[PDB]
Amino acid sequence: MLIAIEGVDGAGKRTLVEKLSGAFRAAGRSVATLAFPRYGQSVAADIAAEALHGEHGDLASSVYAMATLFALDRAGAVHTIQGLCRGYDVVILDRYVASNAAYSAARLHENAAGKAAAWVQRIEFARLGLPKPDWQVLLAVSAEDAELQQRTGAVYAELAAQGWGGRWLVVGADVDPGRLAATLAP
Numbered sequence: 695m696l697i698a699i700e701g702v703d704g705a706g707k708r709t710l711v712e713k714l715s716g717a718f719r720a721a722g723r724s725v726a727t728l729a730f731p732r733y734g735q736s737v738a739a740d741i742a743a744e745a746l747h748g749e750h751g752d753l754a755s756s757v758y759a760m761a762t763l764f765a766l767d768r769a770g771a772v773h774t775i776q777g778l779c780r781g782y783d784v785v786i787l788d789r790y791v792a793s794n795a796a797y798s799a800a801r802l803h804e805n806a807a808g809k810a811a812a813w814v815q816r817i818e819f820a821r822l823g824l825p826k827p828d829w830q831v832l833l834a835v836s837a838e839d840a841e842l843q844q845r846t847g848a849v850y851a852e853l854a855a856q857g858w859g860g861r862w863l864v865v866g867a868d869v870d871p872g873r874l875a876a877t878l879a880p
């Protein structure tokens with residue numbers, strides 16, 4: 695089973711990942727995890743971060759340019775992902791494709807049924823061959839550029855509402871991880 699944990703920066707996705715990992719292993723399931731973007735590994739990720747800190751001329755000004763860099767990062771990992779899906783019962787990704795749809799649409803003031811969200815699907819899942827997650831779990835919290843983080847949170851909820859790329863669940867900060875693991879388990 696492939697699971698992506700999503701949400702805005704500061705939402706506390708890592709803690710969820712760890713909580714879920716323990717709940718799955720308590721239920722007798724092997725678990726592997728990966729975090730995106732892969733800063734310090736993917737040159738594409740690293741240029742993208744660097745660009746948001748004012749490096750690389752006008753790169754940050756294009757949403758699609760940033761989106762593309764983050765896609766190329768995930769694509770470089772596509773074989774690792776598929777490998778972990780064969781090697782372990784449950785594979786949990788801290789951020790995945792939906793992050794690109796949410797930050798891009800937010801940025802462009804578009805909704806989940808808009809162009810950017812559909813572009814991300816075409817590029818990442820169809821063209822680049824990233825496998826679609828079985829579940830996407832939106833960690834949606836009150837308090838994690840504030841304008842964009844709030845709007846990205848909203849777009850994310852919209853992705854979950856439309857079933858973008860697959861089934862979702864939306865959860866809060868105090869979700870019970872054992873209950874969540876039983877819900878997600880085949």
Ligand SMILES: C[S@@](=O)c1cc(-c2cccc(OC(F)(F)F)c2)[nH]c(=O)c1C#N
Pocket residue numbers: 730731746757758760761764765789790791793794795797798801
């Ligand atoms: C690194 S996480 O915040 C992220 C952001 C964007 C993203 C997409 C478009 C524009 C963008 O720039 C900015 F955030 F400034 F809006 C970021 N795309 C991703 O795939 C991931 C991941 N993982």
